[PDB]
Amino acid sequence: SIERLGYLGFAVKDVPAWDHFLTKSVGLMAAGSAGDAALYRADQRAWRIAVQPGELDDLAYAGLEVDDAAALERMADKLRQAGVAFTRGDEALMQQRKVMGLLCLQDPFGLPLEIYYGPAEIFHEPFLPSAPVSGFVTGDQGIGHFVRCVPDTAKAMAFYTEVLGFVLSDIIDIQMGPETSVPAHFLHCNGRHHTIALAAFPIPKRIHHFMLQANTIDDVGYAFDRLDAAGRITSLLGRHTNDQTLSFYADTPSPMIEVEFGWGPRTVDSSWTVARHSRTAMWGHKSV
Amino acid sequence: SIERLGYLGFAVKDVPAWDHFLTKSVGLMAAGSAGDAALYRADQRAWRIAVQPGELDDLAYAGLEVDDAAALERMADKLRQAGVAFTRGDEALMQQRKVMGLLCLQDPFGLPLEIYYGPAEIFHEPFLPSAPVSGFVTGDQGIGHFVRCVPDTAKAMAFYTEVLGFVLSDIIDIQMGPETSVPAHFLHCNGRHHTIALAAFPIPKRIHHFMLQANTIDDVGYAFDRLDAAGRITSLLGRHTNDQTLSFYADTPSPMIEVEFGWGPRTVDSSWTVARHSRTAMWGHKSV
Amino acid sequence: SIERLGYLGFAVKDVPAWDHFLTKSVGLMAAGSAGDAALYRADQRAWRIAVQPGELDDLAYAGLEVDDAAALERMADKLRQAGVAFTRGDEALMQQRKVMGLLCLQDPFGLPLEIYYGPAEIFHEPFLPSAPVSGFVTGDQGIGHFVRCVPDTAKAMAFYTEVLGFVLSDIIDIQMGPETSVPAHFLHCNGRHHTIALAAFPIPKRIHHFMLQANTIDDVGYAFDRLDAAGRITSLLGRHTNDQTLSFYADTPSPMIEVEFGWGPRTVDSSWTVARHSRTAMWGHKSV
Amino acid sequence: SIERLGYLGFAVKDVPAWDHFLTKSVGLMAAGSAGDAALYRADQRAWRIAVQPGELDDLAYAGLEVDDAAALERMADKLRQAGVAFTRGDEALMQQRKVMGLLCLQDPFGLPLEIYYGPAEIFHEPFLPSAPVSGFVTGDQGIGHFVRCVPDTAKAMAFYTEVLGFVLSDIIDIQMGPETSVPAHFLHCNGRHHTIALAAFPIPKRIHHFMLQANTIDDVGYAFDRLDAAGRITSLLGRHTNDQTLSFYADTPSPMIEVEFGWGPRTVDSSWTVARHSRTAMWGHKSV
Amino acid sequence: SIERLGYLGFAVKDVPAWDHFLTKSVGLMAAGSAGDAALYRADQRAWRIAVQPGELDDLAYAGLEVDDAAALERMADKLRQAGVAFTRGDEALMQQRKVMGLLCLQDPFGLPLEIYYGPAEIFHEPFLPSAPVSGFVTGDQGIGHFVRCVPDTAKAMAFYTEVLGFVLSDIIDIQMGPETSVPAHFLHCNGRHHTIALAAFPIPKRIHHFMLQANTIDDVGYAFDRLDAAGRITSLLGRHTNDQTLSFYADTPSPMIEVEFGWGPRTVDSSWTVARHSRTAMWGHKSV
Amino acid sequence: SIERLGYLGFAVKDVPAWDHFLTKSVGLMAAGSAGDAALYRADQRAWRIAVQPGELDDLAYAGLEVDDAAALERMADKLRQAGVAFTRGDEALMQQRKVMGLLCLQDPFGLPLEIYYGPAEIFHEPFLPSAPVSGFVTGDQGIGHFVRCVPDTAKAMAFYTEVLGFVLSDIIDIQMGPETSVPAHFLHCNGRHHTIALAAFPIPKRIHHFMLQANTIDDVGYAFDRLDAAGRITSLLGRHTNDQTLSFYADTPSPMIEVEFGWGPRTVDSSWTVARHSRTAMWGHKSV
Numbered sequence A, B, C, D, E, F: 001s002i003e004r005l006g007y008l009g010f011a012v013k014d015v016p017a018w019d020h021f022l023t024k025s026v027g028l029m030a031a032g033s034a035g036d037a038a039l040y041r042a043d044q045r046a047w048r049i050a051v052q053p054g055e056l057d058d059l060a061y062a063g064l065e066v067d068d069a070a071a072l073e074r075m076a077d078k079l080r081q082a083g084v085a086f087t088r089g090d091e092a093l094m095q096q097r098k099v100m101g102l103l104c105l106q107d108p109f110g111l112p113l114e115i116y117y118g119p120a121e122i123f124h125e126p127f128l129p130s131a132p133v134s135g136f137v138t139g140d141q142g143i144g145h146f147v148r149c150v151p152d153t154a155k156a157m158a159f160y161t162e163v164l165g166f167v168l169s170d171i172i173d174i175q176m177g178p179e180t181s182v183p184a185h186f187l188h189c190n191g192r193h194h195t196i197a198l199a200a201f202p203i204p205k206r207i208h209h210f211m212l213q214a215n216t217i218d219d220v221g222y223a224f225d226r227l228d229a230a231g232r233i234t235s236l237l238g239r240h241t242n243d244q245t246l247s248f249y250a251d252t253p254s255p256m257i258e259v260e261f262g263w264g265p266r267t268v269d270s271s272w273t274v275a276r277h278s279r280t281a282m283w284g285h286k287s288v
């Protein structure tokens, strides 16, 4: 079973715009480069987000983390049993990602996934944000979450839960029109209420947004003003019905992909109960 | 010395509008009437806000509280020494306000003030809000605060500090134009960062707004949506530079008088230091 | 200034009934005798309540405590300045009361008061209740409180506050008839919300009741059942509007004198505010 | 006013016996010598107890500490006003005691007292006990306490309270015979329930005992066994009625002078109340 | 009485070197300029340290803060009574320093001091360090401390304590040679163990060093490595005997002026006791 | 599975030097002898470190602890299944080691290991350090850790994890030259981040160092100065990247074997994640 989401790689048309966005607006720390990919940090890991030039303007891959070598072999066993194709990353890839081992595969709809273990940490180069943010909530909960767009939620659910070991937290019927709603399924693989949400949205992107969680409410408030100064705000502040994350949304430089920046959600444990919600926000989140 | 702000009375042109506003939108509890004044509660006091019909569309009076009978006589002594005219409230007024004694006077610019002691409490009729609000922060800090508009800040400061015993917390230069700012003076008389702020604003109202503080951030979030549904929002959520109150503003039914609804400020004590700020918001509070 | 109420002495027609009442029902510890007075303990003091035979069926005296010898002399000075007659207790009385010194006087309406210091404690004979009670709340707050009946509340207030140093906490208008109420004044001399309450009740007793405070709510619950088994209950459980004590009342063997047995009130400090209440109970206390 | 007891000096006939006693049995740290005086530490101070050869076999002097230079001059002023003779310690004495200034005087019955300020600390030579003891409770409460034998308690009380600023905590009537008791007066000058107790005992020593307080109950338990192995125990474990110190007593090498080694007493503050006790122990302390 | 040390201004020969030093090595935030002075922040204040070109290579002035306007006038009164010359800062200076009022004077040996109130804060531009540091401990304790070199400690003590209201914490005899020591006097004006220390050192600088206190021990550890990479370390890590600050020292670009960077000292209150120490370090601080 | 590391035995050429080193410098308590082995304590166990004369100047054996008799038999079963030779310790050895049972074996490269249960404790002889140290962190985490030098890390890993039940925490690539690094594997068997680390170092010793963890940072600071006075320091203070232990290193009297003395690491639990680090220190640890 996947333990947490550890990294994201984007392929974008405007690297300089993404660079400014991730550092000056979001607050991530610039962390050099690996080949043609620019690297960004949010904590002690050598990198958390990679940005490389490309026409996709989308998520290129997502790194799914396990706790040790044996766990990785067990995942390989699960993939084999499920008939899911995969390739072991070679030395060059391991060195590029800074991991001790990885399996390369795709989800049922073409998103490359990399299951890995043994990521590099660099405590001798302590994290220093590029903008005022006290810090990000990562650790055992991983880097954050993202919404995976899919054409068949049922099929997507079978793969993420039966193969990768994610678990359903809850469902929100997200209103699309006067008489049309999309049942978004929010999935956890640790204490983070959701690490991946599945939704049949009509957008031409692999993902709808990625989310980062900051330590304080002020972190979120200040970030709002920075993104507003950049003219990127897509929602006012609000708080979600399901995880109680207080956040706002903004456009990334890649069309139709947003970032969510939030604080203070509830966490999940073994006693979690599946529920359904008719709205995404308990309050706020008006679209701008 | 005044211990806290205990009550506010408004004279307005649309009582039904104010009634709906205070109950369904703000969350106060309807508490009957006393003569032609409708009464509203925020806690265990018999009333905190009174609304009566009148062409003023403004604050008619403010109740300033002291802790006992001797304290009231000491205030009478201070008023006499300062040459400030006042009248002792008669039995009819005491019965109307539900207090054991009061002194009626005006500030240097015509706002009626009532210094009182011994207010009525009704614990046998526990507070029940008219809208979802976990509760208000009152107690020793009083009902909240208001911004007193004045034509001469220096003169106003001498009266409120030298006569009534308020103390300056800090000053914010509130930008009015490209090269014009108003030095707002925020005053305390207890732990509440400010109970009265003095400002030379060019509006034709005795006050710019009154403020209520709720127990939780969700209280504020939910209230925002209620006031937005009523079409009354004047500012987005934000957090102040001086008291760190997280709030939003909305129009009352009386033109040019707003309400501020907030949470989580810092409090003051004997070790407080006077400072100056160039902005009212550390983040947010964009005008709408 | 009086620091706390330390002891009470009753003169009663049925000593055996009072003995059973204080021990088997209330839970006090039998502590021998001193002359014709039976002694009862509630904590580490050698005694707290004394019961002696007499036709009064009433409170014979109340012991008011100060912290040291100098404090006692200062009280003697206050009594002299106020023109209040008093006599220094002789060795025999000091030995009888187990105190290092005392002043004997009366309040304006004939209740004997004894101001003392240096009471005897007996930690080598640890308190053991006669009925199931985890313990009583005494210490700096003294033994409890009592309601002093007076024919002139104003006169009584001047003596207790101006001479003895008690301070008004609040007032409750206790309804006596359809259009008649008695303004009961509750006074403190330490953290205990009230140690003495003054009221112009039409009963022929020096006091309306005395009160003891137990450590837990169960203490109160169990005591209710014991007093109910004895057929003495006068009120159901309830909670007061002013001090938030949760209690019930019961008859003592002396006609028209009750006992109040309670738990969990709020305490007072320097920031206390005088208020007025129209009811004695926020909930409960129905008369039985 | 004296702030705390800081040091004790003994003049004894058997220095080696005292050396072994203070180190191997009590647990103090050997700290070299100053002239013919051996020094012992209990914490960060350069020394706390001094032992020098002499026929007295008794306390030679006690050091009473104040917080600064001005405080010392104020004490000199009090001594002058009271007619108490004193001499300012010269440089040689200051250097010997390791203090910034001192006044040498005697109590009314010949015990030399030294009022000082600015004691030497040696944090670069951290305290290391000579026997298993987690540490001693000193700090603002000073080194411990002692019982001062006096022929006239009233006279002694006037000096210690009126001149030195000590305050009475309480009195215990210590039984000497079938119909004879000694009223011991326990005095504080800080949070320590008592720093000096005054008693008219019929022993030929300036003091009855000195006391040290350890951090844990085990400290006391282990110390008991060490002193028992040395054949010095004079009392079983017990707990005092007045300060609730749990301790035992043992003989020092000087006849009729004991040491008390204890733990866990209650402390005093401004709200302390004078009381009287008929026993020294709530439990235990049987004489051996 | 001075409440805290609020700012420091240096006049130096190598501004670029100081700029790099304060930002990349120490971690302060660059905050623009005011005239020919570069400004640096450590928290919410508009500035804390100023650096301007000059041949002094030394501290040009120190800002001493009070809590309000009345306090400033009271300081002016103290200066007048003491015969100390001073000039009220004009509008240009007030605007330059960003304060509501100030008095300009010098200490007895020529160090310019500025007593001020009403400093500017900029919460809308949250502090962002230039190097990895979780934050600095300032607030009521002010910016940090400095060691003031003086030729006459007695004279310096009279001015700082009798005129400015500082209070002696303790003294350390700092060894200079085999038989020569300098009695350094550490002074407080708030909870910070020392804000100014006075010492008769034989260096040709107004100050020996200034000190900044960080939130964590890691902050100090990481800063050590940064300053070591710059070749500026003058002492190994160590902990002081008097305040228990754990720190290290490094050279600033101005010859013979160092910076101390530390964490975790003890704080002082009304119960503080003057003591003397023979060493500056309980452990560590070896000179490099 | 091994539960913790309980004891270490060294065979050395200079017993007196080791004796002084372990007591006066490190702070261990001398605990007599057993045959030709000198014994040393760090807590309530009868002994933790043994030193005997021998030409090895190295670790002679390490004691690996299990919780009960059944656990020991289960370990014997694991050794048999794995084909690892072992001998049950006879009565003489059990008596020498003070254990209820033990199995004697060697790791793949000749280090004798003893798996035991039922160690002797001596609470009646409470631990007393020979130098100032508040205490050591042992308990369920065992005595500390050591770095086991091995010529084949893969082979060593298979034995320690597959046979003894240790688990990999993380890996650090320890730089040996400009283009050469050694992958050190840190292993846990309880909450202690590592109890044994495996590394292919080119030194001629069975171990690179052993480590003891003290209760406070001051413990470490003071120990540094003691070892520096002895001329044994090999590293400055620093903090590790993987366990966050703050420590320093020093030479033992046996050439090329060091001691690490530290404080405050993070602990591990079931949710631990394997990671890789490029440095041993987040800060400090410069070689001396």
Ligand SMILES: Oc1cccc(-c2ccccc2)c1O
Binding pocket: A147, A172, A174, A184, A208, A211, A240, A241, A242, A243, A245, A260, A280
């Ligand atoms: O973290 C989250 C929690 C709940 C809902 C959303 C969501 C809202 C709008 C569109 C897609 C998802 C979300 O992002």
Ligand SMILES: Oc1cccc(-c2ccccc2)c1O
Binding pocket: B147, B172, B174, B184, B208, B211, B240, B241, B242, B243, B245, B260, B280
């Ligand atoms: O509570 C408050 C704290 C700081 C500023 C304001 C304010 C803002 C705009 C206009 C008037 C006042 C305020 O209300």
Ligand SMILES: Oc1cccc(-c2ccccc2)c1O
Binding pocket: C147, C172, C174, C184, C208, C211, C240, C241, C242, C243, C245, C260, C280
């Ligand atoms: O403790 C108390 C607090 C408030 C009211 C009463 C009271 C009620 C009925 C009659 C007399 C007093 C009381 O006893």
Ligand SMILES: Oc1cccc(-c2ccccc2)c1O
Binding pocket: D147, D172, D174, D184, D208, D211, D240, D241, D242, D243, D245, D260, D280
């Ligand atoms: O600390 C103490 C507290 C109470 C009593 C004693 C005492 C007992 C016997 C003889 C003298 C004093 C004591 O030492």
Ligand SMILES: Oc1cccc(-c2ccccc2)c1O
Binding pocket: E147, E172, E174, E184, E208, E211, E240, E241, E242, E243, E245, E260, E280
């Ligand atoms: O903060 C401090 C506390 C104690 C001593 C010093 C000090 C040490 C060497 C030279 C000058 C001062 C210091 O800086």
Ligand SMILES: Oc1cccc(-c2ccccc2)c1O
Binding pocket: F147, F172, F174, F184, F208, F211, F240, F241, F242, F243, F245, F260, F280
């Ligand atoms: O406890 C530890 C944690 C991390 C690294 C080391 C280490 C450093 C240098 C050489 C060998 C090991 C260590 O001792």
Ligand SMILES: [Fe+2]
Binding pocket: A145, A147, A209, A211, A260
């Ligand atoms: Fe989301």
Ligand SMILES: [Fe+2]
Binding pocket: B145, B147, B209, B211, B260
């Ligand atoms: Fe406001």
Ligand SMILES: [Fe+2]
Binding pocket: C145, C147, C209, C211, C260
């Ligand atoms: Fe009552």
Ligand SMILES: [Fe+2]
Binding pocket: D145, D147, D209, D211, D260
């Ligand atoms: Fe004693």
Ligand SMILES: [Fe+2]
Binding pocket: E145, E147, E209, E211, E260
């Ligand atoms: Fe310093």
Ligand SMILES: [Fe+2]
Binding pocket: F145, F147, F209, F211, F260
């Ligand atoms: Fe190590």
